[PDB]
Amino acid sequence: PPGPTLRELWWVFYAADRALEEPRADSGLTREEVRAVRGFREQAWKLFGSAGAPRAFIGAALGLSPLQKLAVYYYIIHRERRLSPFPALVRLVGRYTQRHGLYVPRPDDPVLADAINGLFRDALAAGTTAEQLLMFDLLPPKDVPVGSDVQADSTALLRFIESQRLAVPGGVISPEHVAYLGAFLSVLYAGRGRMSAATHTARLTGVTSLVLAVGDVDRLSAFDRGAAGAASRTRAAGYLDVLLTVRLARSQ
């Protein structure tokens, strides 16, 4: 069974930051597990930055720490095998639990299911936008700007959607698709929300259906049942995995 589980995500989501703010946090676990928490914190900064230096990336309007975003990020991907850093994180939370007690989320803490659904809808909005764009192989002419990180993200998403055969087999990824999806992502990577990104992209492209498509995303949840709920969980896992591979390659 691929990890991480909802229980594992819960312990890390609500107490990993509070556990790291304790002096003897690593005194409970081993060296190989320190090295696992090491890379997890490294990638959290490489993807989302700091609480004071936040990078522009997906899940920007969720009000989550970089560790909380990354934990939700891996749970949606749901491909942690035997080399997962989560048991090291759980044992870190366990040691904090032995010292300062069990931490219960306060009434103004992030809601876990909303944190999952927010990142899950962000991933579906980007993919469903790239899907709507590829349905038109001719759009108002634009060129991809010179130095935009959203170019690498947008290109990888469009190429991945061709591999999924969600777009009609035969179409071409034109520079208009790369540029207009990058405009959606640049807005989405702010705190503007999916609707503000869909409407702004629909203004530029003229794709009228682009707004209602993102609206149907908001009618979905990462906990839906049946083949439909699993099909959306697969899309969100793929899109987030596509953006993850790019962001980790450009950071090296």
Binding segment for Cl ion (CB under 5 A), chosen from 89-97, 104-112, 136-144, 152-160, is: 136-144
Tell whether residue 136 is a contact of Cl ion (CB under 5 A): yes
Nearer Cβ to Cl ion (133/243)? 133
Among 13, 73, 96, 118, binds Cl ion (CB under 5 A): 118
Nearer Cβ to Cl ion (6/168)? 6
Binding segment for Cl ion (CB under 5 A), chosen from 51-59, 72-80, 141-149, 234-242, is: 51-59
Tell whether residue 51 is a contact of Cl ion (CB under 5 A): yes
Tell whether residue 163 is a contact of Cl ion (CB under 5 A): yes
Q: How many residues bind Cl ion (CB under 5 A)?
A: 9
User: Token pair 């993807």 is at which residue?
Assistant: 47
Nearer Cβ to Cl ion (30/163)? 163
Q: What is the secondary structure of 85-117 as a DSSP string?
A: SHHHHHHHHHHHHHHH------TTSPPHHHHHH
Tell whether residue 182 is a contact of Cl ion (CB under 5 A): no
- Residues 178/181/187/188 CA torsion (nearest 10 deg): -120
Among 6, 135, 230, 231, binds Cl ion (CB under 5 A): 6
- Number of Cβ within a 10 Å radius of residue 103: 15
Contact 120, 58 (CB under 8 A): no
Residues, the chain, total? 252
Contact 144, 151 (CB under 8 A): yes
Residue 49: φ, ψ to 5°: 80, -150
Binding segment for Cl ion (CB under 5 A), chosen from 5-13, 26-34, 80-88, 98-106, is: 5-13
Tell whether residue 5 is a contact of Cl ion (CB under 5 A): yes
User: Long-range pairs for 188-197 at CB < 8 Å and ≥24 separation?
Assistant: 188/58, 188/60, 188/122, 188/125, 188/126, 189/56, 189/57, 189/58, 189/60, 189/150, 190/56, 190/60, 190/61, 191/60, 191/61, 192/61, 193/61, 194/121, 194/122, 194/125, 194/218, 197/125, 197/129
Binding segment for Cl ion (CB under 5 A), chosen from 80-88, 91-99, 103-111, 186-194, is: 186-194
Distance of closest approach, residue 35 Cβ to Cl ion, in angstroms: 19
Distance of closest approach, residue 66 Cβ to Cl ion, in angstroms: 5
Distance of closest approach, residue 1 Cβ to Cl ion, in angstroms: 8
Nearer Cβ to Cl ion (32/108)? 108
Nearer Cβ to Cl ion (30/39)? 39
Residues that bind Cl ion (CB under 5 A): 5-6, 50-51, 118, 136, 138, 163, 187
